[PDB]
Design a protein around this ligand. Structure first.
Ligand SMILES: Cc1cc2nc3c(=O)[nH]c(=O)nc-3n(C[C@H](O)[C@H](O)[C@H](O)COP(=O)(O)OP(=O)(O)OC[C@H]3O[C@@H](n4cnc5c(N)ncnc54)[C@H](O)[C@@H]3O)c2cc1C
Ligand SMILES: Cc1cc2nc3c(=O)[nH]c(=O)nc-3n(C[C@H](O)[C@H](O)[C@H](O)COP(=O)(O)OP(=O)(O)OC[C@H]3O[C@@H](n4cnc5c(N)ncnc54)[C@H](O)[C@@H]3O)c2cc1C
Lengths: 533, 533
């Protein structure tokens, strides 16, 4: 409804944390710049993923922008880990303060883009038939999206109230008096279920694969601590930029294999009581050594058995057969304790898979469960899912989707050869999802917008990764992943392992500070490994 | 070039073992019937997969047709496990004997099919613009196909001779005097490499994931044994139909967890010396128990260490971290022994991934390898890959591809609700690939063609799976797989595991004889769970 321009220096796709700061920084650099966004307003995942209990897994004081001193001083975070509604208020504040919505077209989806060698510009199409010409195209389209899979058979026949964590109602849902089922126990399930358990007459949790989760120990943020922080906030964030994960997480010196059982328990118990994801770096080899991971995993398995009263239920909740911490660590608030309530029932759908959703509830091989309400607590698509929905055509009319079918091929995760003037923010080939996202997002946005300012300053109009450096980068990302446990998790690859065909690991796991040094050296040498004309 | 008919009772897609016997049996039942095949002649995988060393992993006397007494008496198998060229001669003989090519259109690919409720017929299109109307559609399109993945970067710049195991030249390739590289050590790599090692000046084997393989102990077939067999061949094959795997494999009574190390070694060593895949049923829980698999796996790991002289090379060849025998067991002929030759070199591409194919050879992170010839020893697509290349549209114009995106949904693996008059031979939801394929193929073809004869006999024209029985079957297949180790192998699922979304295991693992009883009871009760009109 705000009409997009016919021509612009830079077109940004997406208005979450990434896209908003791209828009802002490009305005400040003196460029013309516009955003296209599917949703009705700003916030990205914090706008669309609004189920009760949705909460960030990184501390509030770390998971924020640092580019504006006034923002840092004006915003008052209220809790140790911020809720989705509070994050969304923060993002809306940033957008209101800097008048960013004047540069955004909402309710609009980019459907295709192709590059014109004659003009060195992209022509971009949308689902309202807009056609936009942009010199540069910035994909701020995110890592998480709705999976592209049919639902459980029979879902549409359910006769009660049906809710999706991925599209939760805007007004609050009261489950008082109700028999409620939750299907899925990844991130959304673990976060939403204890909130539902507070209200429901009965809650059935349908679990397929059990996931690891550790206690949040969420707490109000001491105002006095926040005031001290604000006096040195800039020094604090420059410390965060100088770590492997983009936060103040203590780095664990010892091997988990070298301590006595006694020392291990004493160390891991301190982390369990403190809460949060810092336990991932309790020891140095948790993600490097099969035996060392299994040790830390076993302690967490025992905490689950200690918490849940019924030993048979406890054992069903115990994750088995796959490594700990090779995905972002889920923080839980009374999720294990929940199973001690008399009105909460775990249904193990590995023993008895779901046969069908029925008008009455859920049928497995053992029995029907009658429900008044059903909640689908869905997981997420592959990290490349959003991008693959757009028909992106580069040199030779080649589809990005075809080129990246064995895994995303990029130079520094920022650009791909054959697709000039196209940049990816916090996506594949970079630290992205395995680090404090806001630290990664700001580093990318600064690098890409500074690069784009350099082009205009030097009279250049086309920027493209060199094919050889892209091949070297992909190989380098594989080589360092192959020294870790991350490759045991199939979901970091696109498609199955096939002899005689390449396979690309999704992300750079060498550490944020290392990655940043690499990018800074590339920029300082005049964009070594890009071809600028 | 033989023109396909305008209208037929049954159209068969594919002219391998499955399609040829469908064609034959439908002719004998008095129906009109025609085949469409991409290749220039018969044989399916035995026609297109023709690299040196390609060989069946099931004994010759078991891996053959049994529907013709004259075929059984006339054919003389020469070896314990038959080579691809010998299998292809057998299939060409069957086709020559029964004049089957008069019913086949070669060089032609089916591209789309849609169902017409008004006529109860399929209309099928091909890539030569043929349009065929068929009452019934039989997919004999196979389990193995070319993977849909980009090649290694730089492959097209290789300046030497480039060979693909999936499309090997028709005239013999002489590697004498040459430096040769093989990339891929699944089935094709393990079979082709020792043949190349006999001729090459130097051979580099580029291994990513090491696979398990056991010795074939191939040997000529004693003519006197074959003569005795032929006098009771019918009794012998009825014994084969009465087993879990469709062969005479001894079924192992004991747990691998209950014997002394001593008894284990003595038992497994006898199997190692006898050769072949019967070791899979040495004990009863090899595929049921994590600890019991790991025990049998460790013995095989030690055989590898015993065979290969250089302990460092041996350890790189040792498969680690995934279970033994959850895929079809590869039989090797001097593959481990090959690494003891002075002209054979293993390159571990987990430590040093391939960066690029170069005009000279292969570059990894450590070094370039100069080669005169490069062989890509490719793996295979998902089992659903062939079917997904055809635009199949059922009731409501729904795409089979969309319906099966979380995994193939079928009743008995034969048919899917919403796609009437369509049958799958030896595909998902049945024993198919985890059993002697010829036993499975003949059971399916007999069941489907008898079903089709019943329809015509009773004046019926539309056959469709009942949605409820399809849901029950899918659930049943998941439930019995979930009691085994098969689900640890990601490749039996289509796409990643996603919370809140269904996941279907590809195959029925309950045993061939059990599956056959199920199908026979369904037919005996008038096709219970199909809707016939
Ligand atoms: C419950 C939960 C907990 C989390 N915890 C953490 C944590 O502890 N640490 C961490 O780093 N991250 C966490 N995250 C992740 C969060 O995704 C990232 O930190 C960050 O918010 C990503 O922002 P973005 O702007 O890059 O992408 P997004 O927020 O995904 O925004 C992308 C936007 O692009 C739009 N878009 C996509 N395609 C198109 C198109 N074709 N046309 C128009 N618009 C399009 C989408 O609609 C969306 O609004 C969590 C996320 C959730 C849901
Ligand atoms: C090296 C090797 C070893 C093997 N060892 C064993 C073993 O030990 N045991 C076992 O059971 N199996 C084994 N097999 C597997 C073998 O695939 C099956 O046993 C059997 O041959 C399958 O026959 P089919 O007729 O169903 O399919 P296929 O032989 O795959 O024939 C399908 C045909 O359909 C054609 N087709 C596909 N789509 C279309 C279309 N759109 N239009 C026209 N034509 C189309 C293809 O071109 C192909 O010719 C092995 C295979 C190989 C390659």
């Amino acid at each position: 409804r705000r009409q997009p321009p016919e021509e612009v220096d830079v077109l940004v796709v997406g208005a979450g944390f990434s896209g908003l700061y791209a828009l802002y920084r490009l305005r400040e650099l003196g460029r013309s710049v516009h955003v296209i966004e599917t949703a009705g307003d700003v916030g990205g995942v914090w706008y669309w993923n609004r189920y009760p209990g949705a909460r960030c897994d990184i501390e509030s004081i770390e998971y924020c922008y640092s580019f504006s001193e006034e923002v840092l001083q004006e915003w008052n975070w209220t809790e140790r880990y911020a809720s989705q509604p509070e994050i969304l208020r923060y993002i809306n504040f940033v957008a209101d303060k800097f008048d960013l919505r004047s540069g955004i077209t909402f309710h609009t989806t980019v459907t295709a883009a192709a590059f014109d060698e004659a003009t060195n510009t992209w022509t971009v199409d949308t689902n309202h038939g807009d056609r936009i010409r942009a010199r540069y195209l910035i994909m701020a389209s995110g890592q998480l999206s709705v999976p592209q899979l049919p639902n459980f058979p029979g879902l549409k026949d359910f006769a009660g109230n049906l809710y999706h964590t991925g599209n939760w109602p805007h007004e609050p849902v009261d489950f008082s008096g109700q028999r409620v089922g939750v299907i899925g126990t990844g991130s959304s399930g673990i976060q939403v279920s204890p909130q539902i358990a507070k209200q429901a007459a009965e809650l059935f949790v349908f679990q397929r694969t059990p996931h690891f989760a550790v206690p949040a120990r969420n707490a109000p943020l001491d105002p006095e601590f926040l005031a001290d922080l604000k006096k040195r906030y800039a020094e604090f964030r420059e410390e965060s930029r100088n770590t492997p994960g983009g936060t103040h997480r203590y780095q664990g010196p010892k091997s988990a294999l070298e301590v006595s059982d006694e020392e291990l328990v004493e160390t891991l118990e301190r982390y369990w009581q403190e809460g949060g994801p810092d336990i991932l770096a309790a020891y140095r080899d948790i993600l490097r050594d099969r035996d060392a991971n299994e040790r830390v995993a076993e302690f967490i398995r025992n905490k689950i058995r200690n918490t849940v009263r019924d030993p048979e239920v406890a054992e069903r909740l115990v994750p088995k057969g796959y490594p700990f911490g090779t995905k972002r660590l889920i923080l839980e608030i009374d999720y294990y304790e929940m199973f001690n309530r008399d009105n909460v029932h775990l249904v193990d759908t590995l023993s008895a898979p779901i046969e069908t959703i029925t008008p009455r509830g859920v049928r497995t091989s053992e029995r029907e469960y009658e429900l008044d309400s059903l909640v689908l607590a869905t997981g997420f698509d592959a990290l490349t899912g959003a991008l693959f929905k757009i028909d992106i055509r580069g040199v030779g009319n080649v589809a990005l989707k075809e080129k990246w079918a064995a895994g995303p091929r990029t130079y520094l995760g920022l650009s791909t050869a054959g697709f000039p003037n196209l940049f990816f923010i916090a996506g594949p080939g970079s630290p992205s999802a395995l680090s404090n996202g806001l630290v990664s997002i700001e580093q990318h946005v600064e690098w890409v917008t500074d690069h784009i300012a350099y082009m205009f300053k030097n009279g250049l109009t086309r920027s493209e990764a060199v094919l050889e450096k892209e091949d070297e980068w992909v190989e380098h990302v594989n080589e360092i992943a192959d020294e870790t446990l991350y490759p045991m998790t199939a979901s970091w690859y696109t498609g199955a392992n096939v002899p005689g065909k390449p396979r690309v690991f999704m992300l750079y796991v060498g550490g944020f500070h290392r990655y940043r040094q690499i990018c800074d050296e590339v920029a300082a040498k005049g964009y070594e490994g890009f071809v600028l004309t």
